[PDB]
Amino acid sequence: VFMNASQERTTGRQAQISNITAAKAVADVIRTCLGPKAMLKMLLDPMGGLVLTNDGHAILREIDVAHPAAKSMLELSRTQDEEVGDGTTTVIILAGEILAQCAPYLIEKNIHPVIIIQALKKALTDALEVIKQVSKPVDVENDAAMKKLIQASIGTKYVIHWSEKMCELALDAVKTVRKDFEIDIKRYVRVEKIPGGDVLDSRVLKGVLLNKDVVHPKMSRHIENPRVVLLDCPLEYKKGESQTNIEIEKEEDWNRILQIEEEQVQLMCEQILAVRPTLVITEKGVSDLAQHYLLKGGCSVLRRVKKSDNNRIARVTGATIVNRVEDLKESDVGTNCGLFKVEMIGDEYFSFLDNCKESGLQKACTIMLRGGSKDILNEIDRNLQDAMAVARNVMLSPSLSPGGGATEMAVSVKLAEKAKQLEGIQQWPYQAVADAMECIPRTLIQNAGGDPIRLLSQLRAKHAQGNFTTGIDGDKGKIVDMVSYGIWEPEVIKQQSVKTAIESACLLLRVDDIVSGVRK
Amino acid sequence: SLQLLNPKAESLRRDAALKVNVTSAEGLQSVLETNLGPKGTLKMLVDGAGNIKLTKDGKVLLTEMQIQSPTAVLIARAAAAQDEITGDGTTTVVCLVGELLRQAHRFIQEGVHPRIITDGFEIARKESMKFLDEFKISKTNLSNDREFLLQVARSSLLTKVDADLTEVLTPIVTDAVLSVYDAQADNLDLHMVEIMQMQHLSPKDTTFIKGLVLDHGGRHPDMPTRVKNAYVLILNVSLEYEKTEVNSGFFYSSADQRDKLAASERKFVDAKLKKIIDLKNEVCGMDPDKGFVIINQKGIDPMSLDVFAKHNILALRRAKRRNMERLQLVTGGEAQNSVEDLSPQILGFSGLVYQETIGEEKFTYVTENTDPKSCTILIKGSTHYALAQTKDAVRDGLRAVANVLKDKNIIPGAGAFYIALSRYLRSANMNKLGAKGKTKTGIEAFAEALLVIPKTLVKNSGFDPLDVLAMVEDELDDAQDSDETRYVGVDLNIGDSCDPTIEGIWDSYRVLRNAITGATGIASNLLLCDELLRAGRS
Amino acid sequence: SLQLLNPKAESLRRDAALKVNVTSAEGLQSVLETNLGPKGTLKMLVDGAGNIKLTKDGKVLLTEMQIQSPTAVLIARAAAAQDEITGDGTTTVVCLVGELLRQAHRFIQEGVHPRIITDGFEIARKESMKFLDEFKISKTNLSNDREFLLQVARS
Amino acid sequence: MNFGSQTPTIVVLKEGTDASQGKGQIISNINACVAVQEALKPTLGPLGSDILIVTSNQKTTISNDGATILKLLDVVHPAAKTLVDISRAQDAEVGDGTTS
Amino acid sequence: SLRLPQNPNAGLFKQGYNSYSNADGQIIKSIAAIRELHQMCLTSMGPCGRNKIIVNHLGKIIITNDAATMLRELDIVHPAVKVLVMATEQQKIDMGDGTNLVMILAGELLNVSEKLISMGLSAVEIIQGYNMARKFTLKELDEMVVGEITDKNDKNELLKMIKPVISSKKYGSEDILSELVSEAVSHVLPVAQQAGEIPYFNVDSIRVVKIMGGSLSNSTVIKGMVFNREPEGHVKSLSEDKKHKVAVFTCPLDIANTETKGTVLLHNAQEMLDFSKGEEKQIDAMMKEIADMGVECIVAGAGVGELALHYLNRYGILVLKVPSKFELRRLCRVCGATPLPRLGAPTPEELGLVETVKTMEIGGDRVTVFKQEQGEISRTSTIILRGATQNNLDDIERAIDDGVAAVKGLMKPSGGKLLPGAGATEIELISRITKYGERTPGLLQLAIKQFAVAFEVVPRTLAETAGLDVNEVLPNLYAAHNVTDHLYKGVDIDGESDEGVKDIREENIYDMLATKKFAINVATEAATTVLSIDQIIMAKK
Amino acid sequence: SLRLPQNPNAGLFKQGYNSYSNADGQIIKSIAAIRELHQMCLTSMGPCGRN
């Protein structure tokens, strides 16, 4: 034998055929996950949980696929999520069809892959210009226009029944995090969920929701104007980096050691009382001795807090995190807190911090959600992340692309017209791109139960004469225009679908041979 | 096409996956089918460790027994979360989800798409909320009617146990929630009522106590067992061997210094004891008739127990953390951490303090308070599972009565709410509803699935569920034209109908609102799932 | 109480065996329902020897494929006896048996005893035989016309 | 619609069948003929050397010409059997030059 | 949530049964499975095609480019391939020509249907698309025939039929292999002024006897038969006897005995002395009447006893075993005699005539030569092949069997005529099917347009196996038909193919009209079955 | 006919879980199970009881 190698080496055209067949099977599973009528997929993890969603991102993430080429399709799910967050299912279906539709050849024509890649680069450039021409800008300051825009990703989800309520939650969450360009991030958006309740009763509340009850019974659970001060240091007695190792010669020295530990913690409590904070939040644990001198002055003690929640509390009340108690000043004390209350729920306690709402640092807010179970909460949370991500594209990119499969079909018509004018050896790879673009609107017909032969034939004819906004209706499976359909989608979602799908197809076409299990 | 992606994988889709949600929910509902109702069956669970769980609660059956089917896992997590917030509705949601899948499965075989079926569920459920406003009956808390709280509490009691334990536990739960209602109107369920398991006499001897009871007692014999007037001092500081901070230690030059340094250990202990003695010097008036007790949250050094014995001071150590918060509600005093600042105002008051020693364990009883702000319920049982059966029966009755005082409305039981929705959804004009065409069919599947619960109640009584509901529909026909508004229930004793308002059968408002909302989301997501696969790295 | 008689004996009583008759007949019908009609599916029978048989009739499908479920064996022997005398009706009988069980199983869950359900089948079947005499049309075969035999044979 | 559980894919050829195509198969076929030629290279010429071959039956046979040498060993690879046919055809028709 | 419900249908049928149904798989999946064996036949198509080595479990190696022979020795688990395998078996049994065209054409019809099903076209309307397109294809093949010939006699007329078939298989030999078949056909056909009424012709008239060693150019045509046997009793008399009467006896030569088992019963010793000379004079009486009729050769299929061989050796009468019964009737057609199971005496009308018989070694083994010159032979001949390897001569015998199969398909019907080859006919059918779809509007236009696309594989395979670009030579071929001289454009295999146009009438490469009609009907029906099977049912092992 | 359906949809619970109900004589078997240890304490009853 030689090295680590051989076994059965797949060479020739069958190595690329195995790459096309395996990657095509990735889009066939979520093929029914596209459209407003899309079904759901229940996943079984090795940990014992359950994941039920129609989003191709969460479906392809938990599924373990062992194959050199097929795993590259799994990586495309996080490309759409991390950059945008909407259109993850469209990219996988498009990229899966491009590899099959743009390269049936080399099984027949024996065309070299790089020759096809050179046509894919020119087809991607022309596809971007077509999307820019069919995109009509929309005002970002219109609240009525943003509500119908968020409902785009909602129409394919289960929250479409609450869409009227859901657009209220997604618009106020993005506008609050937006800081004046207008850069926002979801790290400050809280995904915390409340089990049980009514979805209509769920609302976005400013502030941070804590799961911890007040430590002492005499701590006031109702405060008109709370004053919050954040402390990273624990209120307990610090042992120090090096051992103290006190040598006690006389019996009176040992009692002084335990007496200072009471006075040393008391010294840190007296410095806190200088700013008389109503609510004191400590990142680490707190001793039962430190809470007494804080209760005498009116300070409130809480359980240890994670580092992630300390950053959101400082944004709401404007407080500054103060580690050193001696350096604590009135300038770093948080103010303008609306209400402090604690409500009883059987699972856990909940502490509410309300903002007085009245440029500076961006405000933080939490989204309360009342579902029917624990798994329903995780489904709506994934729906909110997809719905709120739509509002981030329109603010950075006011351009608005056509939806309902009109973007992909508009490109397929322009590619077919330039395919005959280009001629050359690249006409076949260039024209084959248009055949892969019409598969996305074709899926909308197969899920609706209509005839894709007669509908797509009239869709291409009415596209040139009628307008560029003509598309497939999801519910009725008919030919309608996106102007009267009332739903649109940002251009960033369509641009990421065309770029990621084509750039990934060029990687799989360059594969010659495949060797498995070389070494680790 | 999954076999090409993974070498070994299992998946079921379309008709294969459609039988997953329908059949798995059918076997789970059949287990709780005989559970529903006061005449329902009683199940006992015995694990491999030897423990015994005997209860009629459907939540214990789901948590103790593992479920391999992933479909019931979604139902088990939904039925468990229903009992968490509302304290009721575990077996109700299971019967709703399991039946609604079967009622909608017949039309799926007819060629109707699942989405337009689930779209009719939301249209039919929103009408149950609009009808819920006119269906509920308002109750004013200014009347302070005790009989109303008795009939509502018996709804959950007659289901779990028989009339023997119901008559005993009915005044106990009512007396527990009576102190919960205050001028502040805030109801705190955890601190006001507790469940303490102790094996004494028989389970039917369970009695109510108006003051906090603890699991600890005096270790020293000379400590008075019964103290007429005791002042409870709350101390969260522990007198005992400390962590000592890495254990530096003592170094003595001569043997005389060895014992001289050993007395320093009692210097810190006796320092805090002198403050308690100074506090006793204020209350020293009428010392023989009165008394002074100490309740500590943490263990107390046995070296210092002899100090409290000479002064006849009862000491309690290793108390629970939640019990420290209730000492202000029972006695009426305040909590004291540091012993440097002491005042007579923070001292509590108790009219009777006694301890009953049974076996090796000793329990301390406190009662006869001037204005007690909290009470307790002492659970007695014959066996280990008997303590858990009463624990699940009383706790489920707590949320049922507590939710009544939260809102001003109450929902009548005995299947009056499920039968009323059947005549409402079937006779409602579809032009008023947002559902048209095939979506009209999905509403009928939701209305028919609600009639199984009143029929399930009859299956446990032995009567024919079809014949007993024939007289219920005939009574509601003439009630509309007679200008008489009356709710018709189901009486399982005589196999005839009844009136939930006259019989006293009532159901909580938050239970049925969250059950239908919760059961709809579970069954809708299962009908919209056309494929079930298993993949992962293990 | 069956295991006391024999250790290896197994049984399913009351609804335990009732769910089997409804499921096994529905599962067998779901396979053969796609073969009903001129647009029906075409099955390819492939045994261990490599023989290929294309037929839409249920008589050959149930004969080549051995049925493990005891409930579907009664349907197979009933469809086989239907093909012996009449030479037709294999798929039709299979679709009727599974449907009669599913429709009657819905009433059993409502508290209806199976005895009175079997009464409604015999009373309604005798009325269908009386309607069969009035619904059928008598023809004259003495003319020996081709057009009448071509349409019947083509169906 | 499926019978039960999951259905594995059916391989076209029978399990255990070795099939390979492309330019790599011809090179493997040529190397099979060259490896057989390596034994008959020193045998060519009047100064050539004999080859000692022992079969599975422990029957000693010594032959200088390549016709009998290929008859003693059992040839498996198909392309190497081509050199055996030309050695037996040269032996039966003429009988000289079977090695060349 | 750890274990799956296993489905309720798991208990139904058995675990060994596997199901492939619509939306459950197949649907251009199984079509992608046959592409592995389809590519196997694409490399074997044409004169530049590649042979394939197949080793059966028995160990016998068969090297040939014939799809019907390759798919026969291969064990294939995939059932839908057997639909294509059995489709190629019909082509070899009946016509015997076009087996490679059936497998390639039927495989591409399933490949062009990949786009049709992807567009949502149901398989019901796909079947109607190929059926109406197949009827139009057979009707247009008659007007394209310029090769109608009424002769079917002269040897030069077979250069447009037998030779083009031999051009594909063993392309290294053209005039050598064509002369062997053309001369064998001229011998088996009777000599007459005008022979009508479709004279009978069978594949048993031409035979192939393979002999190891010798160049293929040294091969010749023998009017008789060449069998490997051992003559006994004497050396032949060469031409001294000239034409000698040959008697073919079905039963062996020996004293006639009953079917039941007998034994000798001797009561006294007087019959023992006459028992030795009794069997001698009994069989001699029947052997004496044969020598009086002038019969120099006796053929007895069964074993001949030594007592019968003793007498026939002194009279100079040849004895030949001929163990096989199939080859026994072939020697009878050479001399033109009647097989006689009885012994009796030879009758003049039932005896044949053979010019000469000799025993020589073609490859080093002694064989008997039945060659008869100046004599009258009816439907008999043989072809002696000379080759260095046994596997190379295996496909040559199949090439000869395919060459004589074209004569059977030419002679039996009214005629096979001719068709332009080298990709000339397949391109002309593309323009006919394409224009046929635009004449009748409807949903079937999608299936008609894709039906003409599958015809592009044949002309490009000749270019692909020649090391040419299918994106240059093939597109330039369609422009050559723009407009007789436009029907003769075809694919060129040569270093001069850069122009991409070579006249077909120069090399006279033609195909049979009846072969293409039978190949399309089988290929279309084979691809129709794969698309008409909705559900697949497997079994254990 | 060769093998039973073996209680379909039994995968809802682990194979170690068993269900016993008052029907099918199990309530009689439970009473009969008491008599196994009941007769053990009958011979131990009274002053003449056996240890």
Ligand SMILES: Nc1ncnc2c1ncn2[C@@H]1O[C@H](COP(=O)(O)OP(=O)(O)O)[C@@H](O)[C@H]1O
């Ligand atoms: N109601 C609808 N009708 C027609 N097409 C729709 C509809 N909703 C979404 N689409 C199309 O489906 C594509 C993906 O949308 P969506 O399902 O929201 O995202 P994802 O596929 O990532 O879940 C979009 O490009 C859009 O054109």
Ligand SMILES: Nc1ncnc2c1ncn2[C@@H]1O[C@H](COP(=O)(O)OP(=O)(O)O)[C@@H](O)[C@H]1O
């Ligand atoms: N004694 C009774 N008579 C009639 N109906 C009853 C009686 N007890 C309970 N019910 C009905 O049974 C239903 C379920 O009650 P319960 O068991 O407390 O809730 P769950 O079934 O969710 O645990 C209630 O809606 C009630 O109307």
Ligand SMILES: Nc1ncnc2c1ncn2[C@@H]1O[C@H](COP(=O)(O)OP(=O)(O)O)[C@@H](O)[C@H]1O
């Ligand atoms: N006397 C000679 N002088 C030169 N060359 C010779 C002589 N004899 C044989 N050879 C060469 O040696 C080669 C091998 O011959 P040999 O081994 O005797 O028989 P074979 O050719 O059958 O192997 C022949 O090709 C021949 O040309």
Ligand SMILES: Nc1ncnc2c1ncn2[C@@H]1O[C@H](COP(=O)(O)OP(=O)(O)O)[C@@H](O)[C@H]1O
């Ligand atoms: N020398 C040649 N030049 C050009 N074309 C040729 C030559 N020899 C054969 N061909 C073409 O190659 C094709 C091979 O087809 P073939 O496989 O023999 O058809 P079939 O399967 O009917 O026997 C023929 O159609 C013929 O036209």
Ligand SMILES: [Mg+2]
């Ligand atoms: Mg979306």
Ligand SMILES: [Mg+2]
């Ligand atoms: Mg209850």
Ligand SMILES: [Mg+2]
């Ligand atoms: Mg019929």
Ligand SMILES: [Mg+2]
């Ligand atoms: Mg030599």
Ligand SMILES: [Mg+2]
């Ligand atoms: Mg040929």
